[PDB]
Amino acid sequence: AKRTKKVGITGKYGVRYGSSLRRQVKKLEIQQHARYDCSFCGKKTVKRGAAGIWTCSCCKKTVAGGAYTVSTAAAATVRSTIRRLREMVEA
């Protein structure tokens, strides 16, 4: 049922390390963990295995991502910059 009101996957750190510190934690930790969605196959088999890596449970497409997420805000910014100036080198 309702195990942890507002302390979800934080019960592993009991009461120690202070409140505010944990809140920040849940935001991140939760992110990277979750069965991440593999843009390739489309099947959410890409699961974070060791820092900045993401292995697929089919074809094993190991992705280059963030320490706690497939792509950070500034990482996707990389996509457009490239694609934008990429068409200016061919056209």
Partner: protein, 202 residues
């Protein structure tokens, strides 16, 4: 074992003898096991693809960069950290660029640059939480931790030592001009105290 941003093992092909001598390229956000990395002057701009800055335009982002075409990388290798390409000039082979620190260090336009930012993103934007993950952390790095505070050690074992209270005694702002044993704290502080306001430059 001791770094937070994947190491791609790119087995290359030797054009001087039928052989596949595996090279090493820092991993960048957006790559994976199956990307086709192309390096060199005539190599179309794409993540992973690396070539001289004179070979790219302003704004282009990169990491694991040279300083002189040939040092097989150097700058922006750590988790995330990238570098922009600003001021330019075809001749002279010079590309004024911006580093992680925000250094306007101008370099050659023939310096190799691995396109894309390093996969390590938002790491120190996460709390180590317990002492442990710090132990196991440096355990595969160097015995540079846990560091003891100077005022703790006695006058003999360190300059900041002693006293009947715990205080340092003299400004922990050692001049950039002291020596081994003399230097211990804030070396060449063109300022000190809580940082607030206009920073990064002027």
């Amino acid at each position: 074992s001791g770094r937070g941003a994947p190491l791609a093992k790119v087995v290359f092909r030797d054009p001087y003898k039928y052989r596949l001598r595996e090279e090493i390229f820092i991993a960048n956000e957006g790559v994976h096991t199956g990307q086709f990395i192309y390096a060199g002057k005539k190599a179309s701009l794409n993540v992973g693809n690396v070539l001289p800055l004179g070979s790219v335009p302003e704004g282009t982002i990169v990491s694991n960069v040279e300083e002189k075409p040939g040092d097989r990388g150097a700058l922006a290798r750590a988790s995330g950290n990238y570098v922009i390409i600003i001021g330019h000039n075809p001749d002279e082979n010079k590309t004024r660029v911006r580093l992680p620190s925000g250094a306007k260090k101008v370099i050659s336009s023939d310096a190799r640059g691995v396109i894309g930012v390093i996969a390590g993103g938002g790491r120190v934007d996460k709390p180590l939480l317990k002492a442990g993950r710090a132990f196991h952390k440096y355990r595969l790095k160097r015995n540079s931790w846990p560091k003891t505070r100077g005022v703790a050690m006695n006058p003999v074992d360190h300059p900041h030592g002693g006293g009947n209270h715990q205080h340092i005694g003299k400004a922990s702002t050692i001049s950039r001009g002291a020596v081994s044993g003399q230097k211990a704290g804030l070396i060449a502080a063109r300022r000190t105290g809580l940082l607030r306001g206009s920073q990064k430059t002027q």
